[PDB]
């Protein structure tokens, strides 16, 4: 079976990829976001949905996980979804300012505020993508993320979480946290993923060098043909 | 039918993508290289080949097209090919030095010299990827590329060309140039592509914003589901 990483292991793998393998953040953020959009189109293919094109709200956090969300949105649009983004805390770095411009010019709207009620989210968006916090989370959910998670936990439409469900302890999960319907584990699952009880758990980030996988015994499954996601079951 | 771009149009589209849409070179080079590796795995799936894993020589030029080649190689390895790279002229920029390290650490070998004879290439490599020059070419094929193209034109194994077959006039082609078996047109075909007479012509670079496609009337076809390549016929 695939390995489920401790937060320490995940941090080491991430730092190896950027330092020893000298991947750039742009590159792996592009592949991660693409895997997300791909996992989502396979779990919730546009023809299975009742709006045409189907609607999706992507909520982006203040760091890299939110970055992945921005990329996911752009790919989702190319895949025939109609995404909307909420991105309340944006770093002023070229990486993030670039991604914003790209999405803007793809006519993906950035909401001024979060719809305050779960019912209103449900009415407007057929799916919600949680791109708030990822494997590095140790918080301390500060505003506005506490208030956002509290809306999310009342939703009826499915949530897709990027890497980790935001607000979960990365290893121990969170019995009173959000309960997503899809979890896209990037590179390999974290220990919290044993607490997942949604329908769809995909592995994404098809970029792990074999030597890295072997050194960490990830026991990653074989991705089919040229697919960048694998459905774990 | 899809539009076939003049060199001027292609230059304008490229500059729009990097300036007005503010995509970064890393990002689109990653998607372009991924489309290449994907086109190649669909045209020459590993089970159709007689070596296991099948062998591929990727020849990288001195610019961005060679960049795409480097990325293509890395993805090809993940897709179950055994690539080898020849990369004689390497810019000393972090983009290219990064990509080299990545390939090195994936245990993809960089050849010290080109096999001097077509027969020796044919014996060692089941496929050859031409990543030498792309849409920006106006040369003036300087050494060592002249000598490389002269080996390539004597090969029996197929050549896959990235964007344009290296040594062709970007609009007018080249009756005495190389004759690849696969052409991966990136973003949209160039006018030289009307002179293509290999078996496989794929379109790649699934990243053209709809507004850009409309402004240039690319008439791009519909990519299927989440695929990043489309077979033109
Ligand atoms: C090891 C690991 C990496 N990643 C992401 C971080 C990087 O993308 P980004 O930084 O854009 O989220 C990439 C490689 O480390 O994959 C995870 O999301 N979770 C993990 O457990
Ligand atoms: C418009 C156009 C872009 N491209 C490439 C260049 C960029 O990738 P790269 O620079 O890594 O080759 C990307 C967007 O312009 O697609 C072509 O290869 N041919 C074209 O005709």
From Swiss-Prot, chains A, B:
It catalyses: (6R)-NADHX = (6S)-NADHX; (6R)-NADPHX = (6S)-NADPHX. It is an enzyme of class 5 (isomerase). GO terms for molecular function: identical protein binding; metal ion binding; NAD(P)HX epimerase activity; nucleotide binding. Binds 1 potassium ion per subunit. Detected in testis and sperm (at protein level). Expressed at high levels in heart, liver, kidney, and testis. Residues 10-220 form the YjeF N-terminal domain. K(+) binds at residues 65, 130, 166. One of its GO terms (biological process) is regulation of cholesterol efflux. Keywords: Isomerase, Lipid transport, Metal-binding, Mitochondrion, NAD, NADP, Nucleotide-binding, Phosphoprotein, Potassium, Secreted, Transit peptide, Transport. It is found in: Mitochondrion; Secreted. It comes from the Eukaryota. Its cofactor is K(+). Its EC number is 5.1.99.6. The keyword Secreted applies. Catalyzes the epimerization of the S- and R-forms of NAD(P)HX, a damaged form of NAD(P)H that is a result of enzymatic or heat-dependent hydration. This is a prerequisite for the S-specific NAD(P)H-hydrate dehydratase to allow the repair of both epimers of NAD(P)HX. Accelerates cholesterol efflux from endothelial cells to high-density lipoprotein (HDL) and thereby regulates angiogenesis. Belongs to the NnrE/AIBP family. This is NAD(P)H-hydrate epimerase. The lineage of its organism: Eukaryota, Metazoa, Chordata, Craniata, Vertebrata.
